[PDB]
Design a protein around this ligand. Structure first.
Ligand SMILES: Cc1cc2nc3c(=O)[nH]c(=O)nc-3n(C[C@H](O)[C@H](O)[C@H](O)COP(=O)(O)OP(=O)(O)OC[C@H]3O[C@@H](n4cnc5c(N)ncnc54)[C@H](O)[C@@H]3O)c2cc1C
Ligand SMILES: Cc1cc2nc3c(=O)[nH]c(=O)nc-3n(C[C@H](O)[C@H](O)[C@H](O)COP(=O)(O)OP(=O)(O)OC[C@H]3O[C@@H](n4cnc5c(N)ncnc54)[C@H](O)[C@@H]3O)c2cc1C
Ligand SMILES: [Cl-]
Ligand SMILES: [Cl-]
Ligand SMILES: [Cl-]
Ligand SMILES: [Cl-]
Ligand SMILES: [Cl-]
Ligand SMILES: [Cl-]
Ligand SMILES: [Cl-]
Ligand SMILES: [Pt+2]
Lengths: 610, 622
């Protein structure tokens, strides 16, 4: 319960932990503290470890499902800050594949018709002509290949944009959206809806576009077209995403240990930020619920202030705080408009757990649904299968990342392992954005809290950070699963969770029962070179960082890079990828690929081949 | 004529020169003798969300009339003689009754529909038991062979049958009914205010293909996808009874607030005066209103007005801005201020927009298309246009024709010919198309508006005699796509460029320094999921002692001027002891305002029909 600190960090998200960690390590500022709003660290990183009772055997005592309510995946290219963080933190031996497809057998459900990725391919993509009244010119082409055709049109309209990096990372995309024009106007002045239309595409075609992709905010929200293509063309050809074995929460979990649980104060809401004139310290007025559930209002002084906060928290602090008025109005207006520049993008994940996976060939008569998104123009948006932690399955996925062409024997081993996973506990995730949020988030307040009566027959221990879905959600989830997997058989989940990442301004819903917005993306007209400059140090010795106003939004790496900019401006710390390269003479990506290649080889030799 | 010089102290400080704040002052003056009030309005115009366009075209086919006028509306439009008794009384007590004219809603089936890539008529969609919707949507068997719109009727009946304890069945389903409906009827154990329509239909088993069909054919998709509760959603939808006979004003809806200014006195209304924060001084006992004024030469004066009573005829977002910026939201029970803040969040902000394309003549008539002409009423599409309304130049003979058609009956031979001729005539005068849409389509137009050059027909002065200044034209991009959609909706390749356009986006910003007056409130408000509006209305009628709130935003009858009226009637009852206007009217006349206005309108339409259509025995002429 400190009273003064050299450096006050607000938010135990990734932005605030990474800050604490870089200051303690590389600048030896051992007079800091993180004040966190809720009763938990990690922010929009919430992973779930649920353990089931083995009902079919006895050799495994319990089995364990790893489910993600927030972040799930990362990549070895384009995220050199995150790979550096992983490596310096020694989390690299826990990285496993996050496969994204089932060789064509993932489901698609559109305009009342359920079918597969291989199916939609048939007959020169003919089915899309049947579900949508497309122009002749939009017939006979993979829908998702239209996104590449538009991208290539933009490039051919912008000869001055000669940037063609092997990896199209944040820098590239910032340059793309601020320097590239359509019809004389930079892409940050356009939406995809207006762009595609202007280009001559039919509205049937556009609707087909923002349905197949699962997320529609790229077309129907206020985000601009240039940042839209950062999120689309983040999926090149053979993308091999990765995750952590025990869930993404291992990252902030490990950052907690290295920072010290005694330097982090949960359930402490910083309420206003004043600046003391004579003393020269920032004064941060807080509100802290003790271990006995009773409120204290108090104050903490600071020489330097680090807000690892998303847009809506910042605005709440702007409105409430006393320093806004202690400021030039034109400047204060600038700040506000600066805060209005990245759109809030609500997301939700709903997780349904089963005693075993019913979407396999054995129980549907259709080609097994394995991994990756099952896309539908229902309110589900995307649906992702998640399976129980199994070291042998992880190793088979590692063999298949370089699938190449296995021998007949490996193909048999692979079929066996893929089959085994359907007999262990598993779970499905509904994951959607923008237009579908309202469907699920009010349906969540309809009905009772869902409780499988035989839930103790199945699960040994459920954690506390699990807020179940309503009976209404489980009914409609089940009705949409029947449609998507084209099956009569969808049993009741043994266990459910709901998470609506949509910011609120309403008092007295339980503080840890509601959560900030999912992600943020640069709005129309925002110039983010300018806004990031302003937000790194909007006030002397007050800094801001996080995913919200980053150049890699929607991803931890954005929070990382954005915090690197506040540490550079404030404490002269070189970017983390860059400090790593100069001490090792190998980029964090080349190192992580080397180390993972070794680990994967060790697992492939122990469970699959040689 | 309005000018500027500001008072230091007043008994009653009215914030806002919208319908609500103008109405406040008028009732206070007439019915309370409160001649110590002032109206401080944010912008350079009275009326609020009520913005009529008067546009003089050159008459090029004659010299007989020098100019021809197209009354277009960027804001308020239309009203009903039933269910709107405060507005009917207001009309009468202000002597506006002789201006009312019909507001037609159909072309006898010739209106267009454009869905899932196909263009067709209202008559087409009815053929073969509504077959076409089964071809455009992958509907379940039990949602086939029915008018899409009747599914809304059937669900309405089903909610009642499921609520036998709700026995209210009035001849006019008014604000009181719908409030009781949304707060007393339940579905699966939960009040309708706990439901969205999206969730509700999906629970009742409708396919998503059906629900999509529904929210596109209704023209407005906010009743399903926004956060307004299923209860108030039905108030909007079943506000259209059997024979829909809407009324509007001859010269446009600006008639109303303009007349109110003349009666309250322009010297009491200070334009370009934004109230910024409200404190409460305890020793003097008066509210303190920090304002900012732009004088006639674009120069700012900062000052204070005191008041014993304060009246906020402001929508949600304006109230929120005052709340955040104000001092009397501190020094209260934090539980109190939090209750007020949450209370302010209970009405969803619903954006709306209108984009008006004007033509020297109506190219969508029989003679320039070779097909059955489109006449009046919305043309519906799942394109981003939403609804498309044709509007015609003011013509008193045309209004007499419509006053006759209203009472459809059975015209003689000679009358049927005159009506046909009058309807052909409206296509040979200047006319306008109006794109009108909400929620999900807002982002299409509002961002497209920021694309391209400002639209300007170079030969516009050949056609237009006087354009106002509160006309902000549409981007060239907006004109291009607007044309693209018209080509589809109207099933032709012949959509000429307009001579003039205007765009009006009723969507709030929280940004400082938006173009100019571009700061426009949200379009309407509808009660959100979970909102008990009975309680909210009580709270907001006097959230602070001697500080009152009113307007459409948190009203009985959202979306409508009548809502602003009934809400203000509640603040005036609460603070100055004034019975509702429709009730005070009734007690002074012993006839309801709706009965009284119906009578008057009957006589006036009699006079006009005798002047232009039929002298009762033989047809008239001109
Ligand atoms: C559904 C979803 C899926 C995602 N998937 C991925 C993925 O696959 N890969 C990926 O790389 N990224 C993913 N992300 C992004 C990732 O979750 C975030 O970008 C990252 O955690 C950003 O952290 P941050 O510190 O910037 O913000 P946050 O983690 O949101 O941290 C903000 C913190 O500040 C606290 N706070 C706010 N106001 C106050 C206050 N006044 N006082 C005290 N504390 C306060 C909050 O409680 C919170 O702990 C996903 C996000 C979501 C929502
Ligand atoms: C497109 C559209 C069509 C409509 N059509 C119809 C129709 O056909 N029939 C019908 O009955 N209704 C219709 N309406 C509804 C009608 O516009 C409103 O219901 C009604 O005008 C509500 O007025 P009000 O006084 O409550 O608020 P407003 O009209 O919004 O007035 C508020 C005023 O307060 C001022 N103000 C705001 N903040 C401040 C501040 N801080 N200080 C000082 N002044 C401030 C604003 O400048 C504004 O003039 C329509 C609305 C729209 C958007
Ligand atoms: Cl089991
Ligand atoms: Cl696939
Ligand atoms: Cl094309
Ligand atoms: Cl019609
Ligand atoms: Cl659709
Ligand atoms: Cl066309
Ligand atoms: Cl056409
Ligand atoms: Pt079809």
């Amino acid at each position: 319960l400190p009273s003064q600190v050299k450096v006050a960090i607000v938010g135990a998200g990734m932005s605030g932990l990474y800050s604490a960690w870089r200051l303690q390590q590389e600048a030896n500022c051992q007079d800091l503290a993180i004040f966190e709003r809720s009763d938990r660290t990690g922010g929009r990183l919430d992973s779930d470890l649920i353990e089931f009772k083995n009902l079919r055997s006895d050799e495994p005592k319990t089995i364990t499902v790893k489910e993600e309510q927030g972040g799930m995946r990362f990549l070895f290219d384009g995220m050199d800050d995150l790979m550096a963080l992983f490596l310096k933190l020694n989390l690299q031996d826990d990285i496993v594949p996050f496969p994204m497809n089932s060789g064509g057998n993932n489901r698609l459900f559109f305009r009342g018709e359920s079918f597969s990725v291989s199916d939609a391919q048939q007959d020169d993509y003919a089915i899309w002509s049947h579900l949508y009244n497309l122009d002749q010119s939009e017939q006979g082409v993979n829908p998702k290949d239209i996104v590449n055709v538009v991208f290539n049109r933009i490039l051919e309209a912008n000869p001055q944009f000669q940037q063609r990096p092997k990896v199209r990372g944040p820098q590239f995309w910032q340059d793309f959206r601020l320097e590239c024009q359509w019809k004389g106007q930079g892409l940050n002045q356009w939406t995809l809806w207006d762009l595609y239309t202007d280009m001559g595409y039919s509205q049937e075609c556009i609707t087909m576009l923002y349905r197949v992709l699962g997320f529609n905010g790229t077309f129907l929200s206020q985000m601009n077209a240039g940042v839209a293509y950062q999120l689309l063309e983040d999926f090149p050809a053979g993308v091999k995403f990765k995750t952590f074995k025990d869930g993404f929460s291992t990252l902030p979990n490990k950052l907690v240990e290295e920072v010290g649980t005694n330097n982090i104060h949960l359930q402490t809401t910083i309420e206003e930020i004043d600046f003391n004139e004579e003393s020269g310290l920032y004064e941060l007025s807080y509100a802290h619920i003790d271990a006995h559930g009773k409120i204290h209002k108090g104050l903490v002084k600071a020489e330097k202030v680090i807000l690892g906060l998303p847009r809506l928290a910042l605005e709440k602090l702007f409105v409430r705080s006393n320093v806004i008025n202690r400021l030039d109005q034109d400047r204060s207006e600038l700040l506000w408009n600066t805060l209005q520049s990245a759109s809030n993008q609500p997301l939700l994940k709903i997780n349904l757990y089963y005693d075993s996976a019913w979407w396999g060939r054995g129980t549907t008569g259709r080609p097994a649904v394995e991994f990756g998104p099952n896309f539908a123009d229902l309110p589900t948006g995307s649906v992702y299968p998640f399976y129980a932690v199994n070291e042998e399955l992880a190793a088979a996925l590692m063999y298949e990342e370089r699938t190449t062409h296995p021998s007949d024997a490996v193909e048999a081993k692979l079929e066996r392992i893929g089959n085994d996973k359907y007999e262990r506990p598993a779970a499905l995730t509904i994951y959607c954005d923008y237009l579908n949020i309202n469907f699920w988030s009010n349906l969540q307040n309809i009905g009772e809290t869902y409780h499988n009566p035989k839930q103790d027959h199945y699960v040994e221990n459920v954690p506390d950070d699990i807020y179940p879905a309503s009976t209404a959600v489980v009914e409609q989830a089940t009705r949409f699963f029947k449609d998507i997997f084209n099956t009569h058989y969808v049993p009741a989940p043994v266990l459910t969770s709901a998470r609506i990442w949509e910011g609120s301004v309403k008092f007295d819903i339980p503080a840890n029962r509601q959560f900030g917005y999912g992600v943020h993306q640069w709005a129309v007209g925002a110039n983010d070179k300018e806004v990031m400059a302003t937000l790194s140090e909007p006030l002397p010795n007050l800094f801001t960082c996080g995913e919200a106003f980053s150049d890699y939004q929607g991803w931890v790496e954005g929070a990382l890079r954005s915090t690197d900019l506040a540490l550079e401006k404030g404490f002269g710390l070189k970017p983390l990828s860059q400090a790593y390269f100069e001490s090792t003479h190998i980029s964090s990506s080349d190192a992580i690929k080397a180390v993972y290649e070794e680990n994967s080889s060790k697992l492939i030799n122990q469970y699959i081949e040689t």
